[PDB]
């Protein structure tokens, strides 16, 4: 009974250390290439009714704007306030191009977007879906 | 006479907690690579007289329904309120196919079930027997 | 994770050393023939919003202005600090003729320019598309 709790604390912590090391190694690409690395902070609530995505991306480097988004393997087209200035900020990106049927069907779950930067590497956004 | 019962309750429940912990650690891999993350929140109450699960399943993905349950190596059948729509609700599932003679013996105790979702992966469910 | 980082560092260093060797060969030719050669020192920034190009051209020869530039296989027009006086300096020229949206779409990445001097020679300018 005692050995099943120390076997879960270690799993929970190992999920975290590996992710921290992975993030540190991800950052080394932007640190050496000379371009800032954009990563999201917190969670995002993509709206099925409007298509607006409310992210909180933070970047440490140049000011680069996104060009496209990938939803469930289907390409999209971004719009709205897309500049991604330096420092943490809030952006109301309105993606469009995919049929709204998937958006209204998939209400409640947390899908994983892939916003495509102009400069290079993309940023993976895990966004919940609201009504 | 007193220690022989407290050395049995602890063993029986240690099996349960170890199985639940390893089920969580196993479903973590599936939710990590490709599949969903349908897990149980809390503990369920399985009636022994009529037979009805009251599980509290939380999932973030497509709507998937269970197809069969396992109660100590015995396959069962599911019918009732079983659709599992995205979110975290309470589902009343009427289990069937099990004889009403192997459950009332251990009323007031806890067992471990195994629900078989539509998308393949199985979730370990902890249930308490109620008369 | 280590292999990818090592490959990235080696790729960047290979680019830098190849460009250095090429510049050395060009300078050798210029010294042999009698007239100096315009070689860019370091990197350059090209603002997509405005079109002004900041370059660090140097030449150990006569003062020859530049007349045209090549962007993505499309000729353009130049103006501004276009004199290119003898000695290393920091010249700021304004590109003209490129479509603003196309270059705006590529903020952050690096491209290759090709300036056209008046004497009858060209200088390759690798520029970062800032904005």
Numbering used by the authors:
A (entry chain B), B (entry chain C), C (entry chain A): 13 to 143
Paper text:
Type IV pili (T4P) represent one of the most common varieties of surface appendages in archaea. These filaments, assembled from small pilin proteins, can be many microns long and serve diverse functions, including adhesion, biofilm formation, motility, and intercellular communication. In this study, we present the high-resolution cryo-EM structures of the Saccharolobus islandicus REY15A mono-pilus and tri-pilus and demonstrate that archaeal type IV pilins can also polymerize into dramatically different filament structures.
The asymmetric unit in the tri-pilus is three subunits, each with a different orientation of the outer Ig-like domain. The inner long-helix domain exhibited a rise of 5.27 Å and a twist of 106.8°, similar but not identical to the symmetry for the mono-pilus (4.95 Å, 104.8°). In contrast, the outer domains formed trimers, breaking the symmetry of the inner domain where every subunit was equivalent, and had three times the inner symmetry with a rise of 15.8 Å and a twist of −39.6°. The final resolution of the tri-pilus reached 3.5 Å, as judged by map:map Fourier shell correlation (FSC), map:model FSC, and d9919. However, compared to the mono-pilin, the globular domain of tri-pilins undergoes a significant conformational change. Rather than projecting out from the N-terminal helix, it pivots almost 180° and bends towards the N-terminal helix. The relative orientation of the globular domain with respect to the N-terminal helix also varies across the three different subunits, A, B, and C, in the tri-pilus asymmetric unit. These different conformations are facilitated by a flexible Gly-Gln-Gly linker region situated between the two domains, and the cryo-EM densities for this linker region are clearly seen. In contrast to the mono-pilus, where inner helices are fully shielded by outer domains, portions of the inner helices in the tri-pilus become exposed to the solvent. In the tri-pilus, the outer domains trimerize to form a closely packed left-handed trimer protofilament, with minimal interactions between different turns of the protofilament. In contrast, in tri-pilus, the hydrophobic inner helices are not perfectly enveloped by the outer domains, suggesting reduced stability compared to the mono-pilus.
